[PDB]
Design a protein around this nucleic acid. Structure first.
Ligand SMILES: Cc1cn([C@H]2C=C[C@@H](COP(=O)(O)OP(=O)(O)OP(=O)(O)O)O2)c(=O)[nH]c1=O
Ligand SMILES: *P(=O)(O)OC[C@@H]1C=C[C@H](n2cc(C)c(=O)[nH]c2=O)O1
Ligand SMILES: [Mg+2]
Ligand SMILES: [Mg+2]
Ligand SMILES: [Mg+2]
Lengths: 394, 555
DNA sequence: GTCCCTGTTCGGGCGCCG
DNA sequence: GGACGGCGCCCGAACAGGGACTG
């Protein structure tokens, strides 16, 4: 017996066009969909269903197995409507329990909104269209409708391990503990056996705003410092640029050396102190969206901020790949998006909306070649001002 | 005959009804054509005579077919189309010959009266009512029982029904390739000719079992096969020729035709250009307005005509070999490319000339051409090509280091064919010793649009220019331009405009702004430019002085 | 807020296919 | 002549954001 589900009032289903797929991904989708159709999990449909949702596939690392992935972001937006200890455990493993969802039927009236279309190489055939009959992987409604079965399944493992923290976010279990990694993996295998029916969050650190150290300062150095401190005062009202700025009176050469007064030196040391204190008055709002901004600092370096209101950052961090003899900005950005989203899920249970510093077309040409999660966050494309890149640079 | 496939259920949009539209006068030749067509369709059950219980009607006509010997019945279903439910179209793109592989045996065949062989949902039939006027004799009323031509549901319902019908055959014959473009079937196989022909007969009997005839008239058995507007020879494909208009006065419609034909030609003709001819359509009034060819458009059209006088062909895809894409630059943001596997044997060609953004440079445009080609390659061949680009590795290295955005080009090798793509100037990372320091600024009054732009310099020089009908952003750009004009080969410039800084920092060499173009010319002239930012109205020295100066008349 | 400037989407011509 | 659907190109209209400004 199914659970009747509805769209949010006044919203029609998704009508998102299918984007080009590589030969590999099409062949994997055709095989996967053949098996799913032969098991009743999906049905071929026609064009009289006006809905569509893009579909692709990802081949997990060192794995010969492909995984189908539906981009249910639009449908999840339109579909009707957290353990603090998880972010503290020594180690956290992420299990892909999405297969379970195919055991539960989907409300017959809702199935039409899960339509998707397999393309073909060189448009040999028209697109081939399916809809779901079961709880789809990637749909907001699947973990919800399944939560009771999930809890009934997990009850005894939780009773026998009260120190373990298990958290569900849509297709995944996040299992965290304080065990030696060998005992930890042994317990994880106990769970993966029980379900026949690696992260280390306490090492995530915050990336503070930092000020240059110099024994000689030019007019240019001080101008730069004063602009950076002026920007930072919006995050930290204690920042003051009175005396440093006082040193810049007149109309001076950029390379003129300015000796720092006592007052200016003390102002600088006080600002260095103030940038240590945590940002005051920043409270997570569940009903609002997490916004993640990323900046390319260059040389494999990336900085990011998670906030909900401007300058009220909930977190600031960095992702720092290595030298980069053959470096791929888009790959590294995709990896950074996945890491930041993983952190957001662990800490708050939401995924962030990403302001991505890339051209839309670059991103859409390549990001699915580096994707490895079963979720996809919302995002948007921004032309960052190089000023903020300089502000967060390390 | 009529396919026994199940019908596709269709409804009208909520709270709407069927068309009630008077039949218009047809000529007698088309009345006779329609009468003969309709008496035969009615004998076959494809249309049914309706009575007075049917309140609906929509106009009918007929036109010649490609085979000029035959007529085609059409219905102006625009009103019923408005009132019909939405569909998800299943034709995702157009197949392309450069994506065909070498096959031992090939057949191209066509379905006879394809639409009229697919049944229509019974509940919907009444909305297809029409009327044949007589050469007065009374005129006969009908409705459709099969798919009509002019209805918006027909193409998708037919393409989907064709796919369902071909599925059992495709399953039994995984290694026979059937390109299915609406009702035209290209069929290729790795069989000897006798066994191929036998398989073709099996395919024809399979279709006939499902109600689709394949008239021999449209059964191509010998090369060159006529397919999708191309000629498919055994080892090369050609495009059936392109006749450009040779008119003397040119209207907007004439230019749309010319540009469409050139774009079509650019899939196999290298070097086609449409920049001038296209910008010649900016802000036009209507299709009939007469545009005079600018001398630039004249020259471009002449070059294209010479290009098109040349003989050219494509080759087929060999999946065991790499795809290579070589890009070439022409001016005004125009690029061409060739995709090939063997050195001088194009699979296809293309052009990219889209103008993205108010301000840009040649490295950005090259990156977006690479992106366009990558996704086109994925559609056609399902894989990404290896690139050959007219840009030195160090140029790209410099840009990817400097550029504050994520940017990337796939596997690529430098190609020494000029015009080489280069950055035309580079901002300094540090202030310059010995170069004068200009503090620049601009103010503009939002009411009067009067403004001022100017600089002070650490060596005591000051200048203020007044401007009419201007904006704050424009005065900031003007102040930068002025400092550039009045400085030596090396110069430090301090601005407070993150607008202007954001523009110049991204190193444009083209812009749609005349002022930004003048600035770019100055930047190219300089040996060294260092451009710093400070916050406005914070009293930072130098900036304070110039802000005071340019605010005098304006704030 | 308003004004300015920039980017994106979408509809309307034309090309091509059936 | 003229009806339909697909894809392509190009351009302009109607949006959407973000940065500077006024007293
Ligand atoms: C060329 C064309 C086609 N169509 C629709 C209708 C039939 C299918 C196939 O086209 P067709 O092969 O030329 O017409 P068809 O009805 O099959 O008849 P035949 O002449 O091939 O026997 O696409 C259309 O609606 N408008 C058009 O201009
Ligand atoms: P649809 O049935 O309109 O497909 C076009 C069909 C296939 C080939 C045939 N054809 C024949 C000839 C002689 C020609 O010059 N062009 C052409 O397309 O029409
Ligand atoms: Mg036909
Ligand atoms: Mg045909
Ligand atoms: Mg200013």
């Amino acid at each position: 017996e199914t659970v009747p589900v509805k769209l949010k009032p006044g919203m029609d289903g998704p009508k998102v066009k299918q984007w080009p797929l590589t030969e590999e991904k099409i062949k994997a989708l055709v095989e996967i969909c053949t098996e799913m159709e032969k098991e009743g999990k999906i049905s071929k449909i026609g064009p009289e269903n006006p809905y569509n949702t893009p579909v692709f596939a990802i081949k997990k690392k060192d794995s010969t197995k492909w995984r189908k992935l539906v981009d249910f972001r639009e449908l999840n937006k339109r579909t009707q409507d957290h353990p603090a200890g998880l972010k503290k455990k020594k180690s956290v493993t992420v299990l892909d329990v999405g297969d379970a969802y195919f055991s539960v039927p989907l409300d017959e009236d809702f199935r039409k909104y899960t339509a998707f279309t397999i393309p073909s190489i060189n448009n040999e055939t028209p697109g081939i269209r399916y809809q779901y009959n079961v709880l789809p992987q990637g749909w907001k409604g699947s973990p919800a409708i399944f939560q009771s079965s999930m809890t009934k399944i997990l009850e005894p493992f939780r009773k026998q391990n009260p120190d373990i923290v298990i958290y569900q976010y849509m297709d995944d279990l996040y299992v965290g503990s304080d065990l030696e990694i060998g005992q930890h993996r042994t317990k994880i295998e106990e769970l993966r056996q029980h379900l026949l029916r690696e992260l280390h969050p306490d090492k995530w650190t915050v990336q503070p705003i930092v000020l240059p150290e110099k024994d000689s300062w030019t007019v240019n150095d001080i101008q730069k410092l004063v602009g950076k401190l002026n920007w930072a005062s919006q995050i930290y009202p204690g920042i003051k640029v009175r005396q440093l700025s006082k040193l810049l009176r007149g109309t001076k050469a950029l390379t003129e050396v300015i000796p720092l007064t006592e007052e200016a030196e003390l102002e600088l040391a006080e600002n260095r102190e103030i940038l240590k204190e945590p940002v005051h008055g920043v409270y997570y709002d569940p009903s609002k969206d997490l916004i993640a901004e990323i900046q390319k600092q260059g040389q494999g370096q990336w900085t990011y901020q998670i906030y909900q209101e401007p300058f009220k950052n909930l977190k600031t961090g960095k992702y720092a790949r290595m030298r980069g003899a053959h470096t791929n900005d888009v790959k590294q950005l995709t990896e950074a998006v996945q890491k930041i989203t993983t952190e957001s899920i662990v800490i708050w249970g939401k995924t962030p909306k990403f302001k991505l510093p890339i051209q839309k077309e670059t991103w859409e040409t390549w990001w699915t070649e580096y994707w490895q999660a079963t979720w996809i966050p919302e995002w948007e494309f921004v032309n960052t001002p190089p000023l903020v890149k300089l502000w967060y640079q390390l | 005959p009529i396919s026994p496939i199940e019908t596709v259920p269709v409804k009208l949009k909520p709270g709407m009804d069927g068309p009630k539209v008077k039949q218009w006068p047809l000529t007698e030749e088309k009345i006779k054509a329609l009468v003969e067509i309709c008496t035969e369709m009615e004998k076959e059950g494809k249309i049914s005579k309706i009575g007075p219980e049917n309140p609906y009607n929509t106009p009918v006509f007929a036109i010649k077919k490609k085979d000029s010997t035959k007529w085609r019945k059409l219905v102006d279903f625009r009103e019923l189309n408005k009132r019909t439910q939405d569909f998800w179209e299943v034709q995702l793109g157009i197949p392309h010959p450069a994506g065909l592989k070498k096959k031992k045996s090939v057949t191209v065949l066509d379905v006879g009266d394809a639409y009229f062989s697919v049944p229509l949902d019974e509940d919907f039939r009444k909305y297809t009512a029409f009327t044949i006027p007589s050469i007065n004799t009374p005129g006969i009323r009908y409705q459709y029982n099969v798919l009509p031509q002019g209805w918006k549901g027909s193409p998708a319902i037919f393409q989907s029904s064709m796919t369902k019908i071909l599925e059992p055959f495709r399953k039994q014959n995984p290694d026979i390739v059937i390109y299915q473009y609406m009702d035209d079937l290209y069929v290729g196989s790795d069989l000897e000719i006798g066994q191929h022909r036998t398989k073709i007969e099996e395919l024809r009997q399979h279709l006939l079992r499902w109600g689709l005839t394949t008239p021999d008239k449209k059964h191509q058995k010998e090369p060159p096969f006529l397919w999708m507007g191309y000629e498919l020879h055994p080892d090369k494909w050609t495009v059936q020729p392109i006749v450009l208009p040779e008119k003397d006065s040119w209207t907007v419609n004439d230019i749309c035709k010319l540009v469409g034909k050139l774009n079509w030609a650019s899939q196999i003709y290298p070097g086609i250009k449409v920049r001038q001819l296209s910008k010649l359509l900016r802000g036009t009034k209507a299709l009939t307005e007469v545009i005079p060819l600018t001398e630039e458009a004249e020259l471009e059209l002449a070059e294209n005509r010479e290009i098109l006088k040349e003989p050219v062909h494509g080759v087929y895809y060999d999946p065991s070999k790499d795809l290579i894409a070589e890009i070439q630059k022409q001016g005004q943001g125009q690029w061409t490319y060739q995709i090939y596997q063997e050195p001088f044997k194009n699979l296809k060609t293309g052009k990219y000339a889209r103008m993205r953004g108010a301000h840009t440079n040649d490295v950005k445009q090259l990156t977006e051409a690479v992106q366009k080609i990558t996704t086109e390659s994925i559609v056609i061949w399902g894989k990404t090509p290896k690139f050959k680009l007219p840009i030195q590795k160090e140029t790209w290295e410099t840009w990817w280091t400097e550029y504050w955005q994520a940017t990337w080009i796939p596997e690529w090798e430098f190609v020494n064919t000029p015009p080489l793509v280069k950055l035309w100037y580079q901002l300094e990372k540090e202030p310059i010793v010995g170069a004068e320091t200009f503090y620049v600024d601009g103010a503009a009054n939002r009411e009067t649009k009067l403004g001022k732009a100017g600089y002070v310099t650490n060596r005591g020089r000051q200048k203020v220019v007044t401007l009419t009908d201007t904006t704050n952003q424009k005065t900031e750009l003007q102040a930068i331009y002025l400092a550039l004009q009045d400085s030596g080969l090396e110069v430090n410039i301090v601005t407070d405009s993150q607008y202007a800084l954001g523009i110049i920092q991204a190193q444009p060499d083209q812009s749609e702004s005349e002022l930004v173009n003048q600035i770019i010319e100055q930047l190219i002239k300089k040996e060294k430019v260092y451009l710093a930012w400070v916050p406005a109205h914070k009293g930072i020295g130098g900036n304070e002085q110039v802000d005071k100066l340019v605010s005098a008349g304006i704030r």
